[PDB]
Structure 1
Amino acid sequence: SFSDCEPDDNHLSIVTLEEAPFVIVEDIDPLTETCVRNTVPCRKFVKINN
């Protein structure tokens, strides 16, 4: 809401599971620090240790 009276409901939070026939998950391209444009970005919470 960039102002007070701006109601919007279009952002959709999406989770998925890593399976090679459907969801290939790879590192970011180190030559560009940018995903190649036929791919999509994603994020994942990763802990440190025990």
Structure 2
Amino acid sequence: DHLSIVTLEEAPFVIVESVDPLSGTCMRNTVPCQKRI
């Protein structure tokens, strides 16, 4: 099944990082996430 999970960047528990400048995707040991503006 597919469902939407909120997340908030804080502490060791959630660390938000930018994608790789060359590849443009998330690296290993990481999962993608979104962000609005």
TM range (shorter): 0.7 to 0.9
Q: Percent identity?
A: 76
Q: Which runs of 5+ in 2 are unaligned?
A: none
Q: Which has the higher contact order (CA 8 A, sep 6+)?
A: 2
CA RMSD after TM alignment: 1.0
In the TM superposition, structure 1's runs of 4+ consecutive aligned residues that sit over 6 Å from their partners are none
Aligned to 2:19: 28
- Give the count of matched residue pairs: 37
TM-score w.r.t. the length of structure 2 is 0.80
Residues 3-37 of structure 1 show CA distances to partners (whole Å, capped at 9, x for unaligned) of xxxxxxx1021001111310000111102111112
AA matched with 2:3: L
Aligned to 1:14: 5
Structure of greater Rg = 1
| Alpha-carbon distance in structure 2 between the residues aligned to 1:45 and 1:33 | 18
